[PDB]
Amino acid sequence: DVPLTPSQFAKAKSENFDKKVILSNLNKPHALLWGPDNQIWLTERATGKILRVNPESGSVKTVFQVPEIVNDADGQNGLLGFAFHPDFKNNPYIYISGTFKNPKSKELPNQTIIRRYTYNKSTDTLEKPVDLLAGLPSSKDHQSGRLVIGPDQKIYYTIGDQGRNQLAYLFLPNQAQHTPTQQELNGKDYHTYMGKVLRLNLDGSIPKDNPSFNGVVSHIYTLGHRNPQGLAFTPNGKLLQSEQGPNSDDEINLIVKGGNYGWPNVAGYKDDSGYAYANYSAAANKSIKDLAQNGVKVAAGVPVTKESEWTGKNFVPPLKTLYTVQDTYNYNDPTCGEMTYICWPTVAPSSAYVYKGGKKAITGWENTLLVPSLKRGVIFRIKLDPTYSTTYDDAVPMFKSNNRYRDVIASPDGNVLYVLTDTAGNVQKDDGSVTNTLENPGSLIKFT
């Protein structure tokens, strides 16, 4: 899709909704869920706290604090994945993922672990931790970490590309396209588990019906992803996803078994438009600079591959891009002054939520996907047809404010939306400029 302008974003104020702050003292609130007890459960990424909030009254309790979570102030690591077992009353388990030190490792001292806890209703806390899958890659960037349980009773988990080929990890070779050998797998070497959607058995083992990649069945379900922070099943069992792109081409994807989503060789569609793959790990010197022009303009010494020059297999294009631009696009927009990036043709989607409606369903919102935006301070509404096979029309912005929206859910009746906002960071103002003064830092807000 074509980028909206600052003026278009500015007008998306959603005055048909009443706003109320439920909680405002949260630290890096990250995921929120409508729990089996009709309470809202949410996570704090850096503290590792799991909170439970009464949706009506706003009363809150800290149910548990995951010990030894590691978080960098300048990082995206910490407590990430969070889901309930679908038959909680009979299987009182909570599944998480988190950043923990890797005793087996200075560069990348940590690992990601997918862990199960048992909920004890009488004492109201979590106990009997079980590591389901450990030794997963960890870094400060592009961790993704959405964890959901599908209709098939398997765990689906997004694990980002770890930031390879950008900023602090510029010279590390991106592994989004790589898959494990049977040896690696046999040795629990999950280095290639970067830029993937994993599909695991509830005990962390490999599903016998997982797809085969380069001749091996591993935990990998799909590959070729950058930073997919949104993952959500539809009522008819399809799997929708949102994913952050570089300077362009954030994506809404339909996840299909064995698909290759193209990163880093392809951003968005395979169109050779506004992006090219500049592989710094293959560069001459590690002194070469990244001009940060999305591969369209690069310094000498770095090999560039056009999207159309890639020789990949099973490439699956996005349902929608937010956004795609042409090669004439100027990635250095003066409007954003110092924080040049905020003006890039992206929205920085932080999650993806399938709106299920209910007795008070919002008129016209049938079959919509809600996608919060960090940098634009809006929640997008994206309509799909009734079979969730295609998007209809464009991504419609809502709730414009000077806030970084991190996650969103709706009440069972469907007339109230609950959102999390970041504690700190940059956001685009109504006038297109940048501010780090957030209106509702680290909050749980409801829109009725």
Ligand X SMILES: O=C(O)c1cc(C(=O)O)c2c(n1)C(=O)C(=O)c1cc(C(=O)O)[nH]c1-2
Residues with catalytic function: 142
Residue 142 near which of a copy of itself, Ca ion, ligand X, none (CB within 5-8 Å, type-dependent): ligand X
Residue 391 near which of a copy of itself, ligand X, Ca ion, none (CB within 5-8 Å, type-dependent): a copy of itself
How many residues of this chain interact with ligand X, rule: CB under 6 A? 12
Cite the beta strand spans of 38-186 per DSSP E.
Answer: 40-44, 49-53, 60-65, 79-84, 93-101, 110-120, 125-136, 144-149, 155-159
Residue 251 counted as an annotated binding residue:
yes
CA distance 319 to 222: 16
Residue 341 near which of ligand X, Ca ion, a copy of itself, none (CB within 5-8 Å, type-dependent): ligand X
Among 45, 85, 116, 142, binds ligand X (CB under 6 A): 142
Write each residue from 268 to 297 as x if it is in contact with a copy of itself (CB under 8 A), else as -, in one continuous string.
Answer: -xxxxx------------------------
Residue 340 counted as an annotated binding residue:
no
Q: Which residues contact 300 (CB under 8 A, 6 or more apart)?
A: 288
User: Residue 409: what residue type?
Assistant: I
Pull the structure tokens for residue 244.
Answer: 């952050």
Three-class SS state of 157: strand
Count the helices and strands in the chain (H runs, E runs).
2, 30
Question: What is the smallest separation between the CB atom of 166 and Ca ion, expressed in angstroms?
Answer: 9
256 part of the interface to a copy of itself, by CB under 8 A = yes
Among 346, 368, 373, 421, binds Ca ion (CB under 5 A): 346
CA distance 437 to 304: 38
Rounded alpha-carbon distances, angstroms, from residue 318 to 1, 248, 308: 11, 13, 16
Q: Quote the distance between the C-alpha of residue 136 and its chain's center.
A: 17
Q: Which stretch binds Ca ion (CB under 5 A): 126-134, 201-209, 265-273, 284-292?
A: 265-273
Cite the beta strand spans of 300-398 per DSSP E.
Answer: 304-305, 320-321, 353-354, 368-372, 379-384, 391-398
Q: Which is nearer to Ca ion, 49 or 146 (by Cβ)?
A: 146
Question: What is the smallest separation between the CB atom of 260 and a copy of itself, expressed in angstroms?
Answer: 8
376 part of the interface to ligand X, by CB under 6 A = no
Residue 244 counted as an annotated binding residue:
no
Three-class SS state of 186: helix
Q: Are strands 125-136 and 110-120 parallel, antiparallel or unpaired?
A: antiparallel
Among 85, 140, 375, 383, binds ligand X (CB under 6 A): 375
Residue 44 counted as an annotated binding residue:
no
Q: Are strands 251-254 and 79-84 parallel, antiparallel or unpaired?
A: unpaired
How many residues belong to the chain? 448
Pull the structure tokens for residue 356.
Answer: 């299920």
Residue 166 counted as an annotated binding residue:
yes
385 part of the interface to a copy of itself, by CB under 8 A = yes
Pull the structure tokens for residue 391.
Answer: 């998007």
Residue 246 counted as an annotated binding residue:
yes
Which parts of this chain interact with Ca ion (CB under 5 A)? 261-262, 267-269, 271, 275, 346
Which parts of this chain interact with ligand X (CB under 6 A)? 76, 142, 227, 244, 247, 341-342, 344, 346, 348, 374-375
Which parts of this chain interact with a copy of itself (CB under 8 A)? 1-2, 254, 256-259, 269-273, 307-308, 312-317, 320, 324, 326-328, 385, 387, 389-394
Binding residues: 76, 141, 166, 226, 245-246, 251, 261, 267, 269, 271, 307, 341, 346, 375
Binding residues for Ca(2+): 245-246, 251, 261, 267, 269, 271, 307
